[PDB]
Design a protein around this ligand. Structure first.
Ligand code: ATP
Ligand code: ATP
Lengths: 383, 106, 379
């Protein structure tokens, strides 16, 4: 759809300029500390998500960014009559101008009409069609503050008000979310079982291989929320252990559809568990049973999710928000990861994220391996 | 196809508006019983329609009021009571603006 | 069943002595006001149902209670050191004693050591085997304000000797009936899916034209899968058809049995009422139950249009099914209703000791051998 390509930064923080040519695919920005990596991500997130009010808290001159479809947003900051006046000029000629002190008053107020004006502007011009998700580099703090909404306020307090909105899970919130997903999946399986019984009763009213197939289907954990239906299926298996093929066709189809809906309702949780357990060595993450999500050692012991190290916590927070996803802006994915996981994390997340623009910023080049043709070295232009 | 929580809440909203229009509730005191009268008729009562509503988003699966949950082992009645509690909680948000719309109606 | 056989009150209120022999059933006490009929009903309700602490608020000399099996309870109020002590001495059992002022302080605390002592005494002696229900003579006051504050409200203006008041008012039995109709509707609705789940297993376990004709006749709607089954029936395998017929017949029988509990009460009320039938209907749009009157013109009206007479019948026919001391059932009643009230209630309350106290002898027609005339022998 629309992918940022040419982004030009003029005199950001009143000290340096920058010009970045992006691709629609993965972009591995490699630079040492001080190259303005995370200011480029804050600028891109505030431009794409439509939070132009945050641009009142940055001291710049001209921030013009061109998308892939030709559309270009130019943000200008001027000082007229000792008042900082900032204008968002589009390529259609419709430009919204607003005062920095008015924006500051608005921000303090929320903790309105100006924000409504910005919202109306971006809405009528469709400037928020494609959203951007920001994976912050300070995501270890999000565990300490336990998506929540006060975390954005705290991070703006200790980072400045230019920071975009933060919606990133913590290694304690993912546990709760997974428990909810398991319970809801059970409820959906029970709903499908009740609907299957209601349709089957009227349907069944209306060949040893069929009996064979029925025995194989009923021989096989992942059970519905209603225990009476589990007793029904166990009674079916016992009757299997203990012409008329028209009813048997409906019975076989009901059992096959029961197993298929059981596998379909657990698709996301099994995909996330497989993606996590591909990384882990001598340790496995599972949800074996009240639902309970934890870690299963190969010795058979069961331990909670507190016991994971820093790298495993980073993989849990990173692979979960990648699944629940647009443009993904990842800041520093190499925190507390050794070389073997750094050489494969980008490949695993690209398996998770397909058809979306990926912009990552790294200090170690071990993230950039396997996709080394997409590296964009960055050097600020000091003035 | 399936029944979600939002369809049940819309049905409860329509029933509460009808109760306000018919019984002529003027203040919050009559609406304190009208909300229960509207809520207990919007709970599903056919098993399938209860599990499908509980499996949808917008409604949690725990009782904030432990005394509202009946002390019985019938799971489906527990889920119906949970639906009733969540319906009362969500209708208490719209009760004030429904009263204001009824006052502006006359 | 330890029914009350004989109650002997000696110098009750320091005024009179009374000795009444009771039958096993239908004790119809007839006497004019001023003879302590209520005083005797309150004494029985404070002996049989436990709660001996109410005897601390009563002035008496000696109270002897004899059950049917032979258990004797002797209660005395004796003062020695200017403080009255209640001595509850059971037959062949332990005796408990307590200070009157201590019990008054325990009751005023509620506005628990003695309560625990009384509970231990009545539990270790098993004094609460049979519970007697009390129907007060001031049930219009209960209509004015089941309810738990009504006991304190009535004890405020009738003294603390008054027993626990558990009696349903009108506009409360309407809520009880509406809740019971809704619960029976939910029971039928859950039994539909339970029948589907059970019949799935039974048809899988199973693997004549008269049976098919019976299944086609038994098809009815109360979702619409039975309509499709009837359509297919209109257009070896005997066992599944037998299972189908049994499931449909059991569904119909449960449909009748769910509403039989309220239809009995509706018939009991509509036996008395004339030119008005009390019934329930479900709305065409919302399917919510309405309970109220149904005139022969087809007009509907709330249960507030009912007269005091009909309201006494509502409060007395209800709470007789939900199961005995009845005080003054002749209040605001027609002479024919006074004649027929005991005959209607004896079918629904059979098997328990029914003590009634009436001022009008019209209540005791047809049971004149049970009419025990009370007479207070003033000291
Ligand atoms: N609020 C600010 N005001 C003024 N100058 C700033 C401000 N924030 C950053 N800078 C300057 O811009 C430079 C770029 O730092 P920035 O915050 O963009 O991250 P970075 O050093 O590239 O590292 P990382 O991407 O890991 O956060 C800083 O070294 C500093 O000189
Ligand atoms: N708390 C009391 N203290 C002293 N005397 C009392 C007390 N309660 C009732 N009495 C006396 O008991 C006698 C009859 O009382 P009670 O109201 O029980 O009898 P009743 O006329 O048969 O009642 P009812 O017809 O309402 O059943 C009267 O002489 C009355 O003064």
């Amino acid at each position: 759809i629309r992918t940022i390509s040419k982004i030009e930064l003029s005199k950001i923080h009143n000290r340096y300029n920058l010009t970045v040519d992006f691709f629609n695919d993965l972009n591995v920005i490699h630079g040492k500390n001080g190259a303005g990596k995370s200011t480029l991500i804050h600028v891109i997130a505030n431009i794409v998500n439509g939070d132009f009010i945050r641009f009142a808290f940055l001291i710049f001159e001209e921030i013009k960014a061109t998308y892939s479809d030709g559309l270009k947003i130019v943000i200008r900051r001027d000082k007229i009559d000792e008042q900082s006046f900032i204008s968002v000029t589009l390529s259609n000629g419709k430009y919204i101008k607003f005062a920095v002190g008015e924006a500051m008053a608005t921000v303090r107020e929320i903790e309105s009409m100006l924000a409504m004006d910005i919202d109306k502007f971006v809405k009528e011009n469709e400037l928020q069609k494609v959203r951007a998700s920001y994976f912050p580099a300070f995501r270890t703090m999000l565990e300490a503050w336990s998506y929540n909404r006060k975390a954005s306020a705290f991070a703006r307090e200790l980072f400045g008000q230019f920071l975009p909105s933060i919606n990133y899970p913590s290694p304690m919130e993912i546990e709760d979310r997974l428990r909810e997903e398991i319970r809801r999946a059970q409820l959906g399986i029970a709903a499908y079982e009740s609907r299957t019984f209601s349709e089957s009763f009227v349907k069944v009213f209306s060949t040893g291989e069929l009996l064979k197939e029925i025995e194989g289907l009923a021989i096989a954990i992942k059970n519905g929320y209603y225990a009476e239906y589990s007793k029904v299926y166990e009674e079916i298996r016992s009757l299997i252990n203990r012409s008329v093929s028209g009813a048997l066709v409906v019975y076989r189809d009901a059992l096959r559809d029961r197993q298929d809906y059981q596998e379909k309702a657990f698709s996301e949780i099994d995909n996330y568990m497989s993606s996590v357990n591909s990384f882990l060595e001598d340790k496995e993450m599972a949800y074996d049973f009240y639902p309970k999500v934890g870690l299963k050692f190969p010795d058979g012991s069961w331990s909670p999710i507190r016991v994971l190290s820093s790298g495993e916590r980073q993989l849990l927070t990173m692979l979960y928000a990648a699944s629940k996803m647009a443009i993904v802006l990842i800041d520093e994915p190499e925190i507390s990861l050794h070389i073997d996981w750094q050489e494969d994390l980008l490949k695993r997340m690209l398996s998770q994220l397909s058809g979306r623009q990926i912009i990552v910023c790294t200090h170690s080049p071990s993230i950039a391996t396997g996709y080394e043709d997409f590296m964009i070295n960055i050097s600020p232009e000091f003035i | 196809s399936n029944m979600t929580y939002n369809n049940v809440f819309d049905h409860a909203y329509e029933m509460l508006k009808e109760n306000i229009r018919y019984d002529d509730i003027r203040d919050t005191d009559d609406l304190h019983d009208a909300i229960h009268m509207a809520a207990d008729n919007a709970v599903p009562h056919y098993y399938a329609d209860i599990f499908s509503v509980m499996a949808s988003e917008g409604i949690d699966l725990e009782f904030e009021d432990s005394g509202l949950m009946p002390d019985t082992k019938d799971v489906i009645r527990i889920l119906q009571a949970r639906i009733y509690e969540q319906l009362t909680i969500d209708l208490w948000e719209d009760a004030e603006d429904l009263l204001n719309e009824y006052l502006e109606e006359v």
